[PDB]
Design a protein around this ligand. Structure first.
Ligand SMILES: Cc1nonc1C(=O)N[C@H](c1nc(Cn2c(=O)n(C)c(=O)c3ccc(Br)cc32)n[nH]1)C1CCCCC1
Lengths: 98, 98
């Protein structure tokens, strides 16, 4: 139990040209801070080629990143949390299949 | 002043990418997490089907806004303020603007 105090008060259109473009999904969880997390979801299974068409010889895959969130502890607590690790998609990349 | 308590105790396929990246260690003693891994694109262009770098496309880092804890007052072991920073989470391949 290393309890610390945190003051919660704090003081893109280029990725549309990507060969593995993605859309943003709003992920809401009332038991978490931040309650709203934007998760990227790849638009296509393949990648956009030179002609602007979807080529299935390449794959758009999401980039999964481990992020820290605050989980309310005990549940529904407005002022006490525990640090937690979750996996979120931050964008998409284009990979050459195996 | 939205002060909350936080218990700090918590409970590569992207090598085949056309816009591959490496990880850079970013350290800050006045921040939690003190160590953040920032992605840095390996090439200016994108790896094509033949395995060669094509400069008609660009590898660009995907910048995401993340929350960190800044020690407040400075050097405080137990009190922080939430802070927004921009981090590179990976790289994508974009078709440049003409
Ligand atoms: C956005 C967002 N949407 O929801 N939550 C968040 C969020 O930013 N949460 C904070 C956070 N998690 C991380 C995880 N992280 C990490 O540990 N290392 C060590 C990394 O190299 C790293 C690299 C890239 C990314 Br991307 C993340 C990385 N960094 N910052 C968290 C909030 C509560 C107080 C403690 C900090």
């Amino acid at each position: 139990p290393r309890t610390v105090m945190v003051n919660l008060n704090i003081h893109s259109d280029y990725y549309n040209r990507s060969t593995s473009p993605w859309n943003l999904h709003r992920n809401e969880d009332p038991e978490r801070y931040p309650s709203v997390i934007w998760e990227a979801k790849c638009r296509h299974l393949g990648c956009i080629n030179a002609d602007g068409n979807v080529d299935y010889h390449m794959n758009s895959v999401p980039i999964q990143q481990e992020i820290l969130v605050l989980r309310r502890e005990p549940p529904h607590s407005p002022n006490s949390f525990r640090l937690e690790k979750i996996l979120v998609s931050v964008g998409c990349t284009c990979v050459t299949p195996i």
